[PDB]
Design a protein around this ligand. Structure first.
Ligand SMILES: [Mg+2]
Ligand SMILES: [Mg+2]
Ligand SMILES: [Mg+2]
Ligand SMILES: [Mg+2]
Ligand SMILES: [Mg+2]
Ligand SMILES: [Mg+2]
Ligand SMILES: [Mg+2]
Ligand SMILES: [Mg+2]
Ligand SMILES: [Mg+2]
Ligand SMILES: [Mg+2]
Ligand SMILES: [Mg+2]
Lengths: 125, 138
RNA sequence: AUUGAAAUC
RNA sequence: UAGUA
RNA sequence: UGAAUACGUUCCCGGGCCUUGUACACACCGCCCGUCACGCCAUGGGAGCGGGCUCUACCCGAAGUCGCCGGGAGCCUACGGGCAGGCGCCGAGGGUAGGGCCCGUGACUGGGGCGAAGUCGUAACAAGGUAGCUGUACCGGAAGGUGCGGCUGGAUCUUUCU
RNA sequence: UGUGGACCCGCCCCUUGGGGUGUGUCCAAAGGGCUUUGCCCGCUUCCGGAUGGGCCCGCGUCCCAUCAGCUAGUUGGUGGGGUAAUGGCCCACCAAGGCGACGACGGGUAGCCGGUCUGAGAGGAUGGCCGGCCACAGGGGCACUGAGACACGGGCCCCACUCCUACGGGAGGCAGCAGUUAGGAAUCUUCCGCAAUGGGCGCAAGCCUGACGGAGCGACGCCGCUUGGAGGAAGAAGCCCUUCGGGGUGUAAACUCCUGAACCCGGGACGAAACCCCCGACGAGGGGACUGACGGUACCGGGGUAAUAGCGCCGGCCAACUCCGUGCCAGCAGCCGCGGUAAUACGGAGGGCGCGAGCGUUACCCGGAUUCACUGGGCGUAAAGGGCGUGUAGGCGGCCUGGGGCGUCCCAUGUGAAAGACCACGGCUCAACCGUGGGGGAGCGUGGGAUACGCUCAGGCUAGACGGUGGGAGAGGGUGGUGGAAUUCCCGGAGUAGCGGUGAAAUGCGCAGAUACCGGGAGGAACGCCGAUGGCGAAGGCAGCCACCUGGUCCACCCGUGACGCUGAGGCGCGAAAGCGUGGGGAGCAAACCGGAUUAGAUACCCGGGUAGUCCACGCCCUAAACGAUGCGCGCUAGGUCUCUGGGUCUCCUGGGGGCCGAAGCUAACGCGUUAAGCGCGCCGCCUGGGGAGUACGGCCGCAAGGCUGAAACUCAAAGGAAUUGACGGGGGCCCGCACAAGCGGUGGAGCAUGUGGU
């Protein structure tokens, strides 16, 4: 645009928006579970993928994802949420954190033990 | 109407030089004459001279080129590679001696109009003045 | 059973 | 009919 | 032992060269659009019901500063005056009537996005089998079809699906 | 009592209420202690200094125009009050004013700065801690006291809330330090000391200080350091691979000597010399004593134990691969994407890579992102040129001279606090931390200077623009009039059995005589040939012929004016078709509709009819593939060829328009290429991934239909442009094969043989 135009109108700043209302920025948020359905994904995939709907301390009610092998969660379970999309599951924008509250660690987990939330074992250790 | 005479000139020279012409008329002004001396003095052109064309003042301009050249495409290199307005009617550019540009680590001009008169960058720097930064040639 | 399936016996 | 070059 | 027939290349099937147009490249057994149905998500309209901000008019108005009185009506007085007290203006805020406005809930209701293999067709991409698109206007389960005018962003000198 | 100072008035200087001055009036005070006649702590009036602050002004300070008009103390005046003091700060009276596209008013959001982070920079984001200014002290008013307050731990009233209450009434305010609770992913000790620095009162001794100086808890951040050092096999065991020979973990352990984190003993700080007392004189200077929370800590010496390692990752981007397990399951995934019985991508193993008292994860910021492009972008076909004009404000502006010195440049000087950043040199054993010193800087005030460029003022020019005169082509527009070919209807003649229509048909029309033919008449719409690759118009658009009324444009002469120019937000006007209102008109054609067909169906394509409409008057609507998908203007940059309209000295030359080809250059390409998409200046308008969506809300316009302006949630890793090689086409051209046609003999029917399906 002409300078005069730039002097009249300016450039407009680019403001992209949050990919995750866990509201107040908050790196995590507290949930109480509501439903613990099982979800089929999309695209070129198939498997029965574990999910929860969660009432938030934000006032939000949202679908989050239970990662790991097996779980211990049901209608009143009470979870922490960290946010983290799934990708195969449209509308699933958050993750349940394994190892806080009534969400269990992950039994017999040896490799990525820090995620999945599972204390160090005592076999030959 | 002809919004920028200086630019017209700067361009007439750009255009003529690119079809390897020998000469170029430009309608004549005093400020136009000035820029041409600096151009001539730094050996980007051979020079200029007044004329009259149809009752009316023009400045003929003698361009200058390299030697004819080797392989496929024997067109000369060009003595004026780059000539370019900077201050412009729609946006005037003024600089003080402290902020005068060094065109092409030395190998380049920046014609530059000051209260001491029209001047190259090193001239102006040494005289210690700044001004409306007219253009740049390299 | 048929191709890994969905459908189908 | 879906995944697959 | 021993025939018949071939004009010809318009048609059907397979194929070779040039050129064309393509939204195909799993390469036409290709792609692909809309209704209806199933699930998930967010969303528009919305009578009433609820809560907040707010402007205009009238009225009530704490505290307090300021103004008036301050009397044969109280207290102090050196008689000048002072104090108590009373009247008023303004004034936090409140009340009534009227508007404009935000939030919540919202029966009822509109379309929308997304979701491996549901339903009816076949609109579009090849001249897509009635070129296509288009503004508008009627019409129709659907995609659409017609009318009028426009544009080339069109090729040519027996019937649907995978 | 009046050094003095206050106020009225006058005079002088100065220049807003600053000094000075003369009469007149008015205004001071406090005492206390002694080492007691000579000191000390105080008191009163004045002028000054220092420090702190109040009010005024210029400039700078986020988002929405889907907020466009706002304002009655409102703008100004005179005179009052009020204050330390200006001022509608407040009040009476007069006047009719003030503000706003340079964004008033309204809505949202936010304490601001030094600086912090990021970035090559420009810039973006941010304002915790430390330092500066502001505001607030449960919410809302108000004043009192005072040098200062409209006062967090002062006062009053109203509201909410908690507690005491003999129900009348009271009390209260951690956004001080700790600490409790609640919300929350999350944020500490109800710690020691006034020893140091600072603050308040006191003559002092001292008393007070959750300011502060320390300790405690958090790997929350930064820095330092430990978990050993040197020997130690052609190499133990175990565990992983294995083409069964071997390869790996691996000098790694074992074990040999060595050092000696931890821990025990001994000693043990600096931080603190003042105030105070003594000499001197209550001074200067000298002397002296008291005082350590941290702490029995730091540091020194002596002794002395081999004494912690975890987390993430190994498909690509990105450093690191093999075996088992598992089979679109279980699961992974930042993005592309891994998993369907051989998975370096899932889970375990061994091994490997990277960091290491940490390592990962989530959130937020700058980055990469020249992806809001000032530096530093774009719009023919990718997102993007307004449908066209007219012109308002605004932006921009030819040649020469002169004045001014606002823009702009230069020199001095002031300001730019400290902390931070930067360069040095120090101090804690290093560093982190800390200290001392140095070096910079835009921006702004002030004085002086330059005048090329931009501004402005004065005068000049004629190359831009406009006018004059003479000449030209044109479906440019408006009004009236008029002409012939065709269709439809009506009258007449003649004349007979069908016509029409399709792929084939049927509906239809016809013996009340149609079709085809000749004559006559009525009426509406559109104008054949000329006709073009043409012409005119700003667009939409404009086509028989005549006349009147009227617009634009080109050329020649070089006559006149003298920059009178370009663009143009908003405004106004024009704006095809369809549509709407009133009133006409109505021949042909034709949405809708009524029928005939075709089809698996056929709300369609084909056929027969047919209303609105198409036409005219007046008034609306205002959209389009309103297309050159290319805004307007000007200057510059090879040519060739065809063509419309001028002019000349008429092979050709010089204009103005219309086409194609193509130098240079441009472009992702295809293309554009003096009719630019080239090289350049000026102005406008527009874009910023796709879907949701030109939808919603809002405003404006419209009689309506609807038009203009125009989002978000949510979702996808694409959506796109041009070209490429193929494949394809109910596309084209050309070819061939027992491919079809031309033939001859057969299978399909029977019985049986054989193979297959199925049972
Ligand atoms: Mg699949
Ligand atoms: Mg398919
Ligand atoms: Mg993993
Ligand atoms: Mg950037
Ligand atoms: Mg246009
Ligand atoms: Mg204009
Ligand atoms: Mg050192
Ligand atoms: Mg019409
Ligand atoms: Mg009408
Ligand atoms: Mg018909
Ligand atoms: Mg529309």
């Amino acid at each position: 645009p002409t300078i005069n135009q730039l002097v009249r109108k300016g450039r407009e700043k680019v403001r992209k928006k949050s990919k995750v209302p866990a509201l107040k920025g908050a790196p995590f948020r507290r949930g109480v579970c509501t439903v613990v359905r099982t979800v089929t994904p999309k695209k070129p995939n198939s498997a029965l993928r574990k999910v929860a709907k969660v009432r938030l301390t934000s006032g939000y009610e949202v679908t989050a994802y239970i990662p790991g092998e097996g779980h211990n969660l049901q209608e009143h379970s009470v979870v922490l949420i960290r946010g983290g999309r799934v990708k195969d599951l449209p509308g699933v924008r958050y993750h349940i954190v394994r190892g806080v509250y009534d969400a269990a660690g992950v039994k017999d987990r040896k490799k990525s033990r820090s995620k999945y939330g599972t204390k160090k074992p005592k076999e030959a250790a | 109407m002809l919004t920028d005479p200086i630019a017209d000139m700067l361009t007439r020279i750009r255009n003529a030089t690119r079809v390897y012409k020998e000469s170029t008329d430009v309608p004549a002004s005093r400020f136009k004459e000035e820029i041409l001396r600096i151009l001539a003095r730094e050996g980007f052109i051979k020079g200029y001279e007044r004329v009259d064309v149809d009752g009316k003042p023009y400045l003929r301009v003698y361009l200058k080129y390299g030697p004819r050249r080797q392989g496929p495409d024997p067109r000369p290199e060009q003595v004026i590679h780059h000539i370019r307005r900077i201050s412009k009617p729609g946006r005037r550019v003024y600089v003080g001696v402290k902020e005068i540009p060094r065109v092409r680590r030395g190998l380049g001009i920046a014609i530059l109009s000051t209260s001491k008169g029209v001047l190259t960058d090193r001239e102006a720097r040494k005289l210690g003045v700044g001004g409306e930064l007219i253009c740049e040639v390299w």
